[PDB]
Design a binder for this molecule. Structure first.
Ligand SMILES: CC(=O)N[C@H]1[C@H](O[C@H]2[C@H](O[C@H](C)C(=O)N[C@@H](C)C(=O)N[C@H](C)C(=O)O)[C@@H](NC(C)=O)[C@@H]3OC[C@H]2O3)O[C@H](CO)[C@@H](O)[C@@H]1O
Length: 618
């Protein structure tokens, strides 16, 4: 036998298994014991009949496979199965210690109650209870018996209502208030009315006794009101402060909430004056930073000087604010002071350090730390690495990511760098990036930005205007090179393409052969459709990477709106910094920095922006 022959038998047993040709599977299983992925076959077998599995079988499998990701998750999964059987005694015999998942934890504590360990059951219940998040259905029975015991502190009950409200979990706020303990029954209806409609906040505030609880509840609803109508909330502050006898800090929080909603282009002069007075009296760093961005996005020089100065000392340490301090100093004719800041920025890694270099006409120096010459360690020769090798061979990147996560975890920086280089050497691009992240190897640029799917990117950009380096930068930011990754919202593959976008792109470009979003997990298909849409927004916005990256992330419409706001009054850097969506702003910064890294590894000059992008009016 050989690894090569086992690979064929492995693919064949999975094929038979998928067809439920169990006679073939039973005959083939024994002959695959020496294949690295045999534990995955055993796991599938055990879970196939989990409802009839004795605990001893599960315990034995979990103990025999300590580094197998699914063996680790089987612990919590079986705890849930024992709960389903109502085998409380068995659950604790199988899992004497608190399990890993929340659902399993709910069942673990209910098992404790069922076996006479009430005090311990209550300690766990309270810990699972104190969250604004909706917990697993399994916890319902636990919270119920906990409350029925008389040991549930009513203050803890009211506290979860506060947490739920803050989390925006109004459905939970309502359910809790609907089952309100007698202690707080008098305000139950008011709370339900507040969660149902935040516009009842003034009524809520006036009809309930002002306490820390009602003040916090009202403050959350107030922010919901400000989001729907900033003026309505602005005008309500006096009455709310009087209704709840709010102190200075509490009144300022209300001012901050409204100020956040008056950052639009449509604000009146009265609203703008009120907003700026509120921000002047604020202690909120993020609010002041948003105001600075408003000055940057409108070309307001005096405003930039004023608001940058209002930032607390700590915020002024940030790369962006240091650059904008230098920008102000340059215009003031303080060359030496400004250029020393820019030179200090150039010594660091990132977007601004590269902007600093281009600003003063100096070539940016990439700091590249090399991994060790020898990457072969005990970690690269053990059984877990052998499983990683097989998983990657079958293109099971998500499954391999979990194995790799265990392998790089709790390792020295040296070992994590060797693992990154080992992955890099084997062209396991996503694993290479994953190891650099785990080890925080930020200056190991070669392993952080591998030339992944190079031939495909070249082929699919040769007929387009978007640079190959640019398409790769976008992919790097989107998927960290894992072709099988999907976001919570459904974005898929290397370029994180949404199903709707793929369909719309295929139609717009008359691309053949696309019939299912599942194909987005194929590297070539993903790169084909992704480079197509990227080229679309690129040409639509005049071959400008700031606009195309922002459009790829937030959509063409948002970019048009932002450009209508700045209206040709600002420069490239101010446009990037003033982007109002933090996700898109960070996305653009990362992509521009990554494109420079890719140009470098391709042998081109890594200048941050083209002369056209750098000099254009925004
Ligand atoms: C698969 C997916 O969800 N993709 C979305 C992508 O999400 C990234 C995102 O990465 C950010 C930039 C990050 O800082 N990640 C950490 C792990 C990191 O240290 N990165 C290093 C700088 C590096 O070298 O890469 C994170 N997501 C969020 C929501 O914050 C998270 O980490 C990796 C992925 O999940 O973000 C894109 C938008 O920026 C999105 O379009 C894409 O669907």
């Amino acid at each position: 036998d050989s690894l090569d022959e086992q690979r064929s038998r492995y693919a064949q047993i999975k094929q038979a298994w998928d067809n439920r040709q169990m006679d073939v599977v039973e005959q083939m299983m024994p002959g695959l014991k020496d294949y690295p992925l045999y534990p995955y076959l055993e796991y599938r077998q055990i879970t196939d009949d989990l409802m009839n599995q004795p605990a001893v079988t599960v315990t034995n499998f979990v103990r025999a496979n300590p580094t197998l990701p699914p063996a680790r998750t089987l612990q919590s999964r079986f705890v849930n199965e024992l709960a389903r059987r109502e085998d409380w005694r068995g659950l604790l015999a199988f899992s004497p210690e608190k399990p890993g998942t929340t659902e399993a934890q709910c069942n673990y504590y209910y098992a404790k109650w069922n076996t006479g360990q009430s005090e311990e059951a209550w300690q766990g219940a309270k810990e699972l209870w104190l969250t604004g998040k909706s917990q697993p259905n399994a916890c319902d029975k636990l919270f119920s018996v906990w409350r029925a015991s008389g040991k549930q502190d009513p203050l803890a009950y009211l506290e979860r209502i506060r947490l739920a409200m803050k989390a925006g979990n109004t459905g939970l706020v309502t359910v809790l208030a609907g089952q309100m303990p007698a202690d707080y029954q008098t305000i139950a209806s008011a709370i339900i009315s507040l969660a149902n409609n935040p516009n009842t906040v003034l009524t809520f505030a006036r009809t309930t006794g002002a306490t820390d609880f009602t003040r916090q509840m009202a403050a959350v609803a107030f922010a919901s009101v400000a989001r729907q109508d900033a003026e309505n909330a602005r005008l309500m502050i006096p009455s709310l402060a009087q209704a709840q006898q709010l102190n200075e800090d509490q009144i300022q929080e209300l001012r901050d909430i409204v100020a956040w909603r008056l950052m639009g282009n449509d604000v009146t002069d009265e609203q703008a004056k009120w907003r700026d007075d509120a921000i002047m009296r604020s202690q909120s760093t993020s609010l002041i930073e948003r105001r600075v961005r408003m000055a940057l996005g409108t070309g307001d020089r005096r405003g930039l000087n004023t608001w940058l100065a209002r930032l607390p000392m700590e915020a002024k340490e940030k790369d962006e604010w240091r650059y904008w301090q230098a920008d102000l100093l340059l215009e003031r004719g303080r060359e030496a002071e400004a250029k020393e800041i820019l030179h200090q920025l150039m010594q660091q890694r990132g977007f601004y350090p590269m902007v600093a270099a281009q600003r003063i006409g100096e070539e940016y120096e990439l700091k590249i730390d090399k991994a060790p010459q020898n990457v072969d360690s005990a970690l690269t020769q053990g059984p877990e690495m052998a499983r990683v090798r097989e998983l990657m061979y079958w293109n099971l990147d998500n499954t391999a990511r979990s194995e790799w996560a265990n392998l790089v975890k709790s390792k020295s920086k040296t070992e994590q760098a060797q693992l990154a280089r080992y992955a890099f050497n084997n062209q396991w691009w996503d694993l290479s990036v994953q190891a650099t992240i785990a080890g925080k190897l930020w200056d190991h640029l070669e392993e952080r930005f591998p030339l992944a799917y190079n031939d495909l990117f070249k082929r699919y950009t040769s007929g387009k205007e978007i640079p190959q380096s640019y398409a790769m930068a976008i992919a790097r930011q989107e998927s960290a090179w894992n072709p099988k990754v999907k976001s919570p919202v459904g974005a898929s593959g290397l370029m994180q393409i949404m199903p709707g976008t793929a369909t719309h792109t295929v139609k717009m470009f008359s691309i053949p052969g696309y019939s299912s979003p599942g194909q987005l997990l194929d590297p070539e298909t993903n790169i084909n459709i992704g480079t197509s849409y990227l080229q679309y927004v690129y040409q639509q916005f005049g071959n400008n990477r700031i606009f195309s990256s922002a459009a790829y992330n937030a959509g063409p419409g948002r970019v048009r709106t932002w450009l209508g706001n700045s209206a040709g009054r600002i420069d490239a850097v101010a446009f990037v910094e003033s982007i109002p969506f933090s996700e898109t702003r960070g996305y653009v910064k990362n992509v521009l920095a990554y494109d420079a890294y890719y140009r470098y590894f391709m042998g081109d000059k890594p200048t941050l922006m083209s002369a056209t992008e750098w000099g254009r009016r925004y």
